[PDB]
């Protein structure tokens, strides 16, 4: 896998950011993580949703460089969203959220699981430290 550059357009929720990618606006869903959301009606705004949302937003808005990294599998979901690992100045946002107890590793669909291990190790640590979602 390789990282490609992108530009922030708007952060939309903990798990979704709109980016300019190869000159087109595109919504990206963050691969392998489930965050409490401020959207959807089966929850609406959930517990730690505003927090997970603020974290994603601050982390991409304050970055110098955003890069996206597609996995080996399909690169869009059924809603037209890009499926990817997103990096703010070198740090993977999906991992940051999980390490902070602000997301859980989602159900995994092979073969889009290259960083699964990496993320699961972060989640175990956030559980052990009892942060946020695990507190």
Curated annotation (Swiss-Prot):
Superkingdom of the organism of origin: Bacteria
Region (Disordered) residue spans: 115-135
Entry annotation: catalytic residues: 29, 37, 81
Basic and acidic residues composition bias: residue spans: 115-131
Localization (cell): Secreted
Residues where Ca(2+) binds: 15, 34-35
Name assigned to this protein: Nuclease A
Species assigned in the record: Staphylococcus aureus
Residue span relative to the full protein: 89 to 223 of 231
């Amino acid at each position: 896998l390789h990282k490609e550059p992108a530009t922030l357009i708007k952060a939309i929720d903990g798990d979704t950011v709109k980016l300019m990618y190869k000159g087109q606006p595109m919504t990206f869903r963050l691969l392998l993580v489930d965050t409490p959301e401020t959207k959807h009606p089966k929850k609406g705004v959930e517990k730690y949703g505003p927090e997970a949302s603020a974290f994603t937003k601050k982390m991409v808005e304050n970055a110098k460089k955003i890069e996206v990294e597609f996995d080996k599998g399909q690169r869009t979901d059924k809603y037209g969203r890009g499926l990817a690992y997103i990096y703010a100045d070198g740090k993977m946002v999906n991992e940051a959220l999980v390490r902070q107890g602000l997301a859980k590793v989602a159900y995994v669909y092979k073969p889009n699981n290259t960083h699964e291990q990496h993320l699961r190790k972060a989640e175990a640590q956030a559980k052990k430290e009892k942060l946020n979602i695990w507190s």
